[PDB]
Amino acid sequence: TIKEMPQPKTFGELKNLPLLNTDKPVQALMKIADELGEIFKFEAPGRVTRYLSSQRLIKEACDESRFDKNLSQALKFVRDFAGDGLFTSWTHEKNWKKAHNILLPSFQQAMKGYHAMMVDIAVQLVQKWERLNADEHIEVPEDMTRLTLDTIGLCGFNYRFNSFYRDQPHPFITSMVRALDEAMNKLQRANQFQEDIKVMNDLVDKIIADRKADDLLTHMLNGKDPETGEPLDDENIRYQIITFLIEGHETTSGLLSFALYFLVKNPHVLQKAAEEAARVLVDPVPSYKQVKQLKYVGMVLNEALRLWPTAPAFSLYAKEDTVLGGEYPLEKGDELMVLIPQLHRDKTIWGDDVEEFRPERFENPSAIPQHAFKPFGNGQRACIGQQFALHEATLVLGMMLKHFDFEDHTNYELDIKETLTLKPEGFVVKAKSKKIPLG
Ligand code: HEM
């Protein structure tokens, strides 16, 4: 028939809330999913969502004729600062489709155009590590953030954040992390955020004052949509700046940190990746063409996104009354949340060793089922920056693996911090230079 949907214990008016009393709500939900399976309902005072974990259900939810992108409480909390820019706009808001057509050509060909500036920041990362004394170590996510922020600032906006000239995190990041944490904390509330938003806006004006006195910024200021013919308004443009400075770097830093984490934890995987880097990256600096030949480095990165997709959930709503999976009636407006780390652990797809780090799972991707691997979201609301993220990550990891041997000197225990994105907090390593000349 039509089944009761599983649901964890409720606690009077508190609903299911006392079950997410944590700074790590996604990891908590993954445990509820392990217990209750492919679908469960979750209620907090005033609001209700349904968490999906199977490819069979997610495949249905990904049917855009039936479900569209929802702004979850977390993205509503975020719309305050990025407005109706691409990430926090509803698909039916005019600026969504409009920015999408106006911005999409900036993301392979734009990539060729971005390569050199990606290499500029990546060489700054390598030089930093080459210059460390023997007694020193690397703070991995902290340096990855320095890299990915500087990369978007330069490739997107021709602005230099100069992150590597500071040994504290950039002033822009510190607000960012506190605003993301606060949006996440706000979630477990039954009943500085202005300061952090103002500090972000503060930087946007710097950028805006800069071009004033061929890249993303160009297309934001000058580009017009081949439908309505209308350009972006200034309000929206400020909104797209803020948007690309966050999503533009946080998830990719997380990815590169998880990737190095898994490599040091899997020395045979590391060996094979380093072997490819050396034979492929024969020039002083890498070319666009060489980065494209780093087949096993891309498999490594995809397998890190499989385990810990760094933007770990996306939210959908029923466009109309519908039945999910031939069993679960939903009313127009009902929220579904896709738990991507749980999707990537669906044993009917992946086999029964879902926790192991095996890049060879991606050896021939043209044989992974559709909707089984979704680290970049779904459909027309999928990550516009997918190829940019991947090219950057593959370039940088490739250069890292060419130029150094890595040591897990603290025997680091994975600790994943959640700011509605994921990163391995406190991950540190030592890197011994192979003493290989740069350009
Ligand atoms: C590994 C790195 C990345 C991951 C895992 C990731 C993940 C995602 C996911 C899952 C979504 C869908 C959000 C939702 O459905 O609510 C998304 C959307 C988006 N992402 Fe990414 N992202 C990454 C890198 C980037 C980069 C480098 C950029 C920009 C340069 C970026 C820009 C965006 C934008 C603008 C959107 C909204 C797209 C739209 O709705 O039109 N992402 N991303």
GROMACS .gro file of N, CA, C and O and ligand atoms in nm, residues 69-72 75 85-89 91 96 100 103 107 152 216 240 243-244 246-256 305 308-316 340 374-378 380-390 392-393, ligand 1:
model
  283
   69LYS      N    1   1.440   2.299  -0.691
   69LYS     CA    2   1.528   2.341  -0.581
   69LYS      C    3   1.449   2.419  -0.475
   69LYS      O    4   1.377   2.516  -0.506
   70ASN      N    5   1.461   2.375  -0.351
   70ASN     CA    6   1.414   2.448  -0.234
   70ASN      C    7   1.530   2.524  -0.167
   70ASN      O    8   1.645   2.483  -0.173
   71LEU      N    9   1.501   2.641  -0.111
   71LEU     CA   10   1.592   2.705  -0.017
   71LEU      C   11   1.559   2.652   0.120
   71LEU      O   12   1.452   2.681   0.175
   72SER      N   13   1.649   2.567   0.171
   72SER     CA   14   1.640   2.511   0.307
   72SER      C   15   1.653   2.625   0.407
   72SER      O   16   1.694   2.738   0.370
   75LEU      N   17   1.986   2.793   0.366
   75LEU     CA   18   2.001   2.884   0.251
   75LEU      C   19   1.914   3.008   0.269
   75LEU      O   20   1.946   3.113   0.218
   85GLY      N   21   2.130   3.601  -0.599
   85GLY     CA   22   2.237   3.553  -0.683
   85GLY      C   23   2.211   3.402  -0.704
   85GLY      O   24   2.120   3.345  -0.644
   86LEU      N   25   2.291   3.340  -0.789
   86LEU     CA   26   2.264   3.200  -0.837
   86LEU      C   27   2.234   3.095  -0.732
   86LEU      O   28   2.148   3.010  -0.751
   87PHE      N   29   2.306   3.098  -0.620
   87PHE     CA   30   2.296   2.987  -0.524
   87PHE      C   31   2.173   2.995  -0.438
   87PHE      O   32   2.117   2.893  -0.401
   88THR      N   33   2.134   3.117  -0.397
   88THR     CA   34   2.020   3.130  -0.305
   88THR      C   35   1.893   3.189  -0.372
   88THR      O   36   1.806   3.241  -0.303
   89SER      N   37   1.883   3.183  -0.503
   89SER     CA   38   1.759   3.227  -0.570
   89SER      C   39   1.671   3.108  -0.604
   89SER      O   40   1.721   2.996  -0.625
   91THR      N   41   1.430   2.902  -0.849
   91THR     CA   42   1.438   2.883  -0.996
   91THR      C   43   1.338   2.973  -1.073
   91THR      O   44   1.368   3.019  -1.183
   96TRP      N   45   1.731   3.426  -1.145
   96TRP     CA   46   1.797   3.294  -1.163
   96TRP      C   47   1.828   3.263  -1.311
   96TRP      O   48   1.946   3.261  -1.351
  100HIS      N   49   2.199   3.285  -1.503
  100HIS     CA   50   2.246   3.156  -1.552
  100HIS      C   51   2.292   3.166  -1.700
  100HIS      O   52   2.401   3.122  -1.736
  103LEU      N   53   2.595   3.419  -1.710
  103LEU     CA   54   2.718   3.370  -1.642
  103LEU      C   55   2.775   3.239  -1.695
  103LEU      O   56   2.894   3.221  -1.693
  107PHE      N   57   3.221   2.949  -1.764
  107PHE     CA   58   3.255   2.819  -1.699
  107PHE      C   59   3.277   2.695  -1.788
  107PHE      O   60   3.257   2.695  -1.908
  152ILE      N   61   3.964   3.218  -0.700
  152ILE     CA   62   3.839   3.276  -0.748
  152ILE      C   63   3.852   3.428  -0.757
  152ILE      O   64   3.803   3.489  -0.854
  216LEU      N   65   3.453   3.653  -1.517
  216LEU     CA   66   3.323   3.660  -1.452
  216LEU      C   67   3.271   3.804  -1.434
  216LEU      O   68   3.155   3.833  -1.468
  240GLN      N   69   2.585   3.845  -0.673
  240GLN     CA   70   2.662   3.743  -0.745
  240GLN      C   71   2.809   3.747  -0.704
  240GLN      O   72   2.881   3.647  -0.718
  243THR      N   73   2.827   3.579  -0.385
  243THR     CA   74   2.800   3.438  -0.411
  243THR      C   75   2.926   3.364  -0.458
  243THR      O   76   2.960   3.256  -0.405
  244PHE      N   77   2.995   3.420  -0.556
  244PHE     CA   78   3.109   3.349  -0.612
  244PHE      C   79   3.232   3.350  -0.521
  244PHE      O   80   3.319   3.264  -0.533
  246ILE      N   81   3.203   3.294  -0.199
  246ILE     CA   82   3.188   3.190  -0.098
  246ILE      C   83   3.194   3.051  -0.165
  246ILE      O   84   3.294   2.978  -0.146
  247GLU      N   85   3.091   3.019  -0.244
  247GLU     CA   86   3.075   2.888  -0.305
  247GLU      C   87   3.192   2.869  -0.394
  247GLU      O   88   3.228   2.757  -0.423
  248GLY      N   89   3.249   2.981  -0.440
  248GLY     CA   90   3.362   2.979  -0.529
  248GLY      C   91   3.491   2.922  -0.473
  248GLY      O   92   3.582   2.893  -0.550
  249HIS      N   93   3.498   2.901  -0.340
  249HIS     CA   94   3.622   2.853  -0.278
  249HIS      C   95   3.613   2.752  -0.159
  249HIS      O   96   3.705   2.672  -0.138
  250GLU      N   97   3.506   2.759  -0.080
  250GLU     CA   98   3.495   2.682   0.044
  250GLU      C   99   3.490   2.528   0.015
  250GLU      O  100   3.564   2.446   0.076
  251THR      N  101   3.402   2.487  -0.077
  251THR     CA  102   3.382   2.343  -0.107
  251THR      C  103   3.506   2.286  -0.172
  251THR      O  104   3.544   2.167  -0.150
  252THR      N  105   3.577   2.368  -0.250
  252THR     CA  106   3.696   2.316  -0.320
  252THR      C  107   3.813   2.298  -0.222
  252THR      O  108   3.895   2.207  -0.238
  253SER      N  109   3.822   2.386  -0.123
  253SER     CA  110   3.925   2.376  -0.017
  253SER      C  111   3.899   2.247   0.063
  253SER      O  112   3.991   2.170   0.093
  254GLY      N  113   3.773   2.225   0.096
  254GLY     CA  114   3.728   2.104   0.168
  254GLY      C  115   3.770   1.983   0.087
  254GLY      O  116   3.828   1.889   0.142
  255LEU      N  117   3.741   1.984  -0.044
  255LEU     CA  118   3.778   1.873  -0.133
  255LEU      C  119   3.927   1.841  -0.136
  255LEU      O  120   3.971   1.720  -0.128
  256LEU      N  121   4.007   1.945  -0.153
  256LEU     CA  122   4.150   1.925  -0.157
  256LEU      C  123   4.201   1.875  -0.019
  256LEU      O  124   4.295   1.801  -0.016
  305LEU      N  125   3.511   1.316  -0.304
  305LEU     CA  126   3.373   1.369  -0.308
  305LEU      C  127   3.273   1.260  -0.282
  305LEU      O  128   3.166   1.285  -0.230
  308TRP      N  129   3.303   1.224   0.132
  308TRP     CA  130   3.270   1.347   0.198
  308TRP      C  131   3.238   1.463   0.099
  308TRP      O  132   3.321   1.554   0.085
  309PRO      N  133   3.124   1.455   0.030
  309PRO     CA  134   3.086   1.559  -0.067
  309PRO      C  135   3.082   1.687   0.019
  309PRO      O  136   3.012   1.693   0.121
  310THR      N  137   3.159   1.788  -0.018
  310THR     CA  138   3.178   1.905   0.071
  310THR      C  139   3.062   2.006   0.080
  310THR      O  140   3.064   2.093   0.166
  311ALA      N  141   2.964   1.998  -0.010
  311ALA     CA  142   2.839   2.066   0.007
  311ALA      C  143   2.740   1.949   0.023
  311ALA      O  144   2.687   1.897  -0.076
  312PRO      N  145   2.722   1.900   0.148
  312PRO     CA  146   2.668   1.764   0.167
  312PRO      C  147   2.517   1.742   0.156
  312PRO      O  148   2.476   1.628   0.159
  313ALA      N  149   2.435   1.846   0.144
  313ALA     CA  150   2.292   1.824   0.126
  313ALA      C  151   2.233   1.932   0.038
  313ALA      O  152   2.282   2.045   0.039
  314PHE      N  153   2.133   1.894  -0.042
  314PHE     CA  154   2.050   1.994  -0.112
  314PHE      C  155   1.903   1.963  -0.095
  314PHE      O  156   1.865   1.848  -0.064
  315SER      N  157   1.823   2.067  -0.106
  315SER     CA  158   1.683   2.065  -0.067
  315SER      C  159   1.595   2.082  -0.193
  315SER      O  160   1.630   2.155  -0.287
  316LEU      N  161   1.487   2.005  -0.196
  316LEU     CA  162   1.391   2.005  -0.307
  316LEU      C  163   1.249   2.027  -0.249
  316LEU      O  164   1.227   2.001  -0.129
  340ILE      N  165   2.360   1.362   0.058
  340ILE     CA  166   2.452   1.310  -0.041
  340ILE      C  167   2.556   1.208   0.015
  340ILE      O  168   2.581   1.108  -0.056
  374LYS      N  169   2.639   1.243  -0.696
  374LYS     CA  170   2.582   1.379  -0.710
  374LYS      C  171   2.648   1.484  -0.617
  374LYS      O  172   2.576   1.562  -0.555
  375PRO      N  173   2.780   1.489  -0.611
  375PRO     CA  174   2.849   1.585  -0.527
  375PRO      C  175   2.820   1.730  -0.576
  375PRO      O  176   2.839   1.824  -0.501
  376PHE      N  177   2.774   1.744  -0.702
  376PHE     CA  178   2.748   1.877  -0.763
  376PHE      C  179   2.600   1.903  -0.787
  376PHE      O  180   2.563   1.996  -0.863
  377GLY      N  181   2.511   1.828  -0.720
  377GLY     CA  182   2.371   1.873  -0.709
  377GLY      C  183   2.303   1.815  -0.832
  377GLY      O  184   2.351   1.715  -0.890
  378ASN      N  185   2.192   1.877  -0.874
  378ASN     CA  186   2.110   1.815  -0.979
  378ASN      C  187   2.054   1.912  -1.084
  378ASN      O  188   2.009   2.020  -1.050
  380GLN      N  189   1.914   2.153  -1.369
  380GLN     CA  190   1.951   2.290  -1.409
  380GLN      C  191   2.002   2.371  -1.289
  380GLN      O  192   2.067   2.471  -1.309
  381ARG      N  193   1.977   2.322  -1.166
  381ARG     CA  194   2.034   2.385  -1.047
  381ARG      C  195   2.161   2.314  -0.997
  381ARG      O  196   2.192   2.326  -0.881
  382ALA      N  197   2.235   2.246  -1.085
  382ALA     CA  198   2.358   2.182  -1.047
  382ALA      C  199   2.464   2.289  -1.039
  382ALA      O  200   2.445   2.401  -1.092
  383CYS      N  201   2.577   2.256  -0.972
  383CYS     CA  202   2.690   2.344  -0.960
  383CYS      C  203   2.733   2.402  -1.093
  383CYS      O  204   2.782   2.328  -1.179
  384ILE      N  205   2.726   2.534  -1.105
  384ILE     CA  206   2.779   2.597  -1.227
  384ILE      C  207   2.932   2.592  -1.226
  384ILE      O  208   2.997   2.595  -1.329
  385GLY      N  209   2.994   2.584  -1.107
  385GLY     CA  210   3.139   2.580  -1.101
  385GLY      C  211   3.208   2.445  -1.098
  385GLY      O  212   3.326   2.438  -1.062
  386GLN      N  213   3.139   2.341  -1.139
  386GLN     CA  214   3.196   2.205  -1.139
  386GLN      C  215   3.334   2.188  -1.211
  386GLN      O  216   3.434   2.139  -1.155
  387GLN      N  217   3.341   2.234  -1.337
  387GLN     CA  218   3.460   2.214  -1.414
  387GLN      C  219   3.571   2.305  -1.359
  387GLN      O  220   3.688   2.268  -1.361
  388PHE      N  221   3.534   2.422  -1.304
  388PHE     CA  222   3.631   2.517  -1.253
  388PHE      C  223   3.692   2.450  -1.126
  388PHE      O  224   3.812   2.447  -1.112
  389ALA      N  225   3.605   2.406  -1.035
  389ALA     CA  226   3.649   2.335  -0.908
  389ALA      C  227   3.741   2.220  -0.941
  389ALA      O  228   3.850   2.206  -0.888
  390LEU      N  229   3.698   2.135  -1.032
  390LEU     CA  230   3.776   2.014  -1.067
  390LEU      C  231   3.908   2.043  -1.133
  390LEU      O  232   4.008   1.973  -1.110
  392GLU      N  233   4.094   2.320  -1.103
  392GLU     CA  234   4.175   2.378  -0.999
  392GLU      C  235   4.233   2.270  -0.908
  392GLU      O  236   4.354   2.270  -0.880
  393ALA      N  237   4.143   2.185  -0.856
  393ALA     CA  238   4.181   2.075  -0.762
  393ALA      C  239   4.282   1.978  -0.822
  393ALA      O  240   4.378   1.935  -0.755
  440HEM     C1  241   3.420   2.046  -0.514
  440HEM     C2  242   3.378   2.175  -0.520
  440HEM     C3  243   3.229   2.204  -0.525
  440HEM     C4  244   3.124   2.131  -0.482
  440HEM     C5  245   3.128   1.990  -0.412
  440HEM     C6  246   3.002   2.208  -0.511
  440HEM     C7  247   2.871   2.173  -0.487
  440HEM     C8  248   2.755   2.237  -0.527
  440HEM     C9  249   2.622   2.186  -0.512
  440HEM    C10  250   2.581   2.050  -0.448
  440HEM    C11  251   2.535   2.279  -0.562
  440HEM    C12  252   2.383   2.264  -0.565
  440HEM    C13  253   2.320   2.345  -0.450
  440HEM    C14  254   2.177   2.316  -0.420
  440HEM     O1  255   2.113   2.234  -0.491
  440HEM     O2  256   2.116   2.383  -0.328
  440HEM    C15  257   2.610   2.386  -0.615
  440HEM    C16  258   2.556   2.503  -0.673
  440HEM    C17  259   2.632   2.610  -0.709
  440HEM     N1  260   2.767   2.615  -0.706
  440HEM    FE1  261   2.908   2.465  -0.653
  440HEM     N2  262   3.044   2.325  -0.569
  440HEM    C18  263   3.178   2.329  -0.581
  440HEM    C19  264   3.254   2.427  -0.636
  440HEM    C20  265   3.206   2.541  -0.689
  440HEM    C21  266   3.281   2.647  -0.754
  440HEM    C22  267   3.434   2.651  -0.773
  440HEM    C23  268   3.192   2.746  -0.782
  440HEM    C24  269   3.219   2.882  -0.852
  440HEM    C25  270   3.334   2.913  -0.907
  440HEM    C26  271   3.062   2.701  -0.741
  440HEM    C27  272   2.945   2.773  -0.764
  440HEM    C28  273   2.815   2.736  -0.752
  440HEM    C29  274   2.701   2.820  -0.792
  440HEM    C30  275   2.705   2.965  -0.846
  440HEM    C31  276   2.581   2.738  -0.761
  440HEM    C32  277   2.430   2.764  -0.784
  440HEM    C33  278   2.406   2.715  -0.926
  440HEM    C34  279   2.266   2.753  -0.973
  440HEM     O3  280   2.171   2.717  -0.904
  440HEM     O4  281   2.258   2.815  -1.081
  440HEM     N3  282   3.069   2.571  -0.688
  440HEM     N4  283   2.745   2.362  -0.593
   0.00000   0.00000   0.00000
